[PDB]
Structure 1
Amino acid sequence: GYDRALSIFSPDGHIFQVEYALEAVKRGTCAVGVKGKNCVVLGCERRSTLKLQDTRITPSKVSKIDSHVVLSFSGLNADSRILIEKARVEAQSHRLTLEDPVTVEYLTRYVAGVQQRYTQSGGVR
């Protein structure tokens, strides 16, 4: 198996691969979340250098993780699918064992844990 430690510390104490991953996020289309008194609204930018798009079938920017929680993102689109899939699976697994849907904090904590794991595992970026 490919083992290389790709995320490592530099002399100044930075993990450049993590910091460069943030640059990919900075390149991604803008996403905004605002919560009201009785709601949360997720807004997303879609770049207009792409005309002739089919918006019926093109992957939407906001994804349902369960019927009560949603996830939007900024950065690499392909990467986000892997996080969304894992989140959706954990959502169903939580309902199965706890007999209660995930809290938004728990679902977030899981997704963040996955992301962290990819910062100190060998062979992954």
Structure 2
Amino acid sequence: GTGYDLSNSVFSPDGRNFQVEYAVKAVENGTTSIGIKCNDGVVFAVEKLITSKLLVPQKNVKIQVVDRHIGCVYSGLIPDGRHLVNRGREEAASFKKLYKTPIPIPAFADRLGQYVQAHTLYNSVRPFGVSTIFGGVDKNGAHLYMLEPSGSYWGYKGAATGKGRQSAKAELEKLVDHHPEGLSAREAVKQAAKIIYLAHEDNKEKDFELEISWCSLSETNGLHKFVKGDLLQEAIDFAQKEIN
């Protein structure tokens, strides 16, 4: 029969969870955001649609930090994203409190994974309406991750989600091929600013604001920091230049 897509934890005859799939639609309908893993860190960038001149520029920050070494960005229902980060934060504090050392990216990824997967187990809750790109630096390297509404996640070289994910993924795949030795934090920041401008074509109708953040063992000391002022503008230009 039908109706398998009305309740959250229900398996359809083909073994799918339709509500999770519908959640994905909310994600695809969102702003595009990405992540790039460099030789000693990671970079995060996102597209901020400027609905109107009334939006105070640079004020509505979307990228969020967890603990002090992790960055998270997401596409979809923004509130759901914050909800997931609040949890990640408790999750990270709990881990540090007990083990003293700040939470490793892999460990952190699974904490978010189990929580998101948890929201696909009952019909009393709705799945998360966001895909989240996050990561940072830890005891042994940099790590990048992307988490789907199903709770599914993997480690990535580069990642993208949202409206222009295809453009972005395409650009990311190029970089991967043309740089088997690894991009640098400095380069990734520019490369990231570009990918976002390019991927902005799938929404070229509205004007936007660029946002970047990074966590590099050499550039930020393994701490997550927002790209501001000069470094930001320099990246804006690098993009504005290669968009023509």
Normalising by structure 1, report the TM-score. 0.89
Cα offset, 1:66, TM superposition: 1.2
Cα offset, 1:122, TM superposition: 3.4
Q: Name the CA distance, whole Å, in 2 between partners of 1:66 and 1:99.
A: 13
What is the 5 A alignment of 1:16-95?
Answer: 16-55=18-57, 57-58=59-60, 60-95=61-96
User: Residues 89, 5 of structure 1: CA spacing in aligned structure 2 closer, same or farther, 3 A cutoff?
Assistant: same
Task: Give the counterpart letter for 1:35 in structure 2.
Answer: K
Q: Name the CA distance, whole Å, in 1 between partners of 2:57 and 2:10.
A: 40
SS of equivalent residue, structure 1 residue 107? helix
Q: CA RMSD in A?
A: 1.6
Q: Name the CA distance, whole Å, in 2 between partners of 1:76 and 1:29.
A: 10
User: Residues 14, 84 of structure 1: CA spacing in aligned structure 2 closer, same or farther, 3 A cutoff?
Assistant: same
SS of equivalent residue, structure 1 residue 9? coil
Q: Structure 2: any 5+ residue segments left out of the alignment?
A: 1-5, 127-244
Cα offset, 1:56, TM superposition: 5.3
SS of equivalent residue, structure 1 residue 50? coil
SS of equivalent residue, structure 1 residue 73? strand
Task: Give the counterpart letter for 1:17 in structure 2.
Answer: Q
Q: Structure 1: any 5+ residue segments left out of the alignment?
A: none
SS of equivalent residue, structure 2 residue 43? strand
Would you say the 8 A contact 2:65–2:71 is kept in 1?
A: yes
Task: Give the counterpart letter for 2:32 in structure 1.
Answer: C
Q: Name the CA distance, whole Å, in 2 between partners of 1:21 and 1:77.
A: 13
Would you say the 8 A contact 2:8–2:20 is kept in 1?
A: no
Q: Name the CA distance, whole Å, in 1 between partners of 2:52 and 2:98.
A: 44
Task: Judging by fraction of residues, say which structure has more strand.
Answer: 2
Task: Give the counterpart letter for 1:113 in structure 2.
Answer: Q
Would you say the 8 A contact 2:37–2:43 is kept in 1?
A: yes
Task: Give the counterpart letter for 2:43 in structure 1.
Answer: V
Deviations 1:22-48 (A, max 9, x none): 111101110110111122110101113
What is the 5 A alignment of 1:7-18?
Answer: 7-18=9-20
Cα offset, 1:57, TM superposition: 4.3
Cα offset, 1:5, TM superposition: 4.9
Q: Name the CA distance, whole Å, in 2 between partners of 1:50 and 1:101.
A: 40
Normalising by structure 2, report the TM-score. 0.47
Q: Name the CA distance, whole Å, in 2 between partners of 1:50 and 1:7.
A: 39
Equivalenced residue count is: 121
What is the 5 A alignment of 1:82-121?
Answer: 82-121=83-122
- Max radius of gyration: which structure? 2
Task: Give the counterpart letter for 2:22 in structure 1.
Answer: Y
Point out 4+ residue stretches in structure 1 off by more than 6 angstroms: none
Deviations 1:96-120 (A, max 9, x none): 0011110011111101111000001
Q: Name the CA distance, whole Å, in 1 between partners of 2:56 and 2:114.
A: 34
Percent identical across equivalent pairs? 35
Q: Name the CA distance, whole Å, in 2 between partners of 1:12 and 1:51.
A: 48
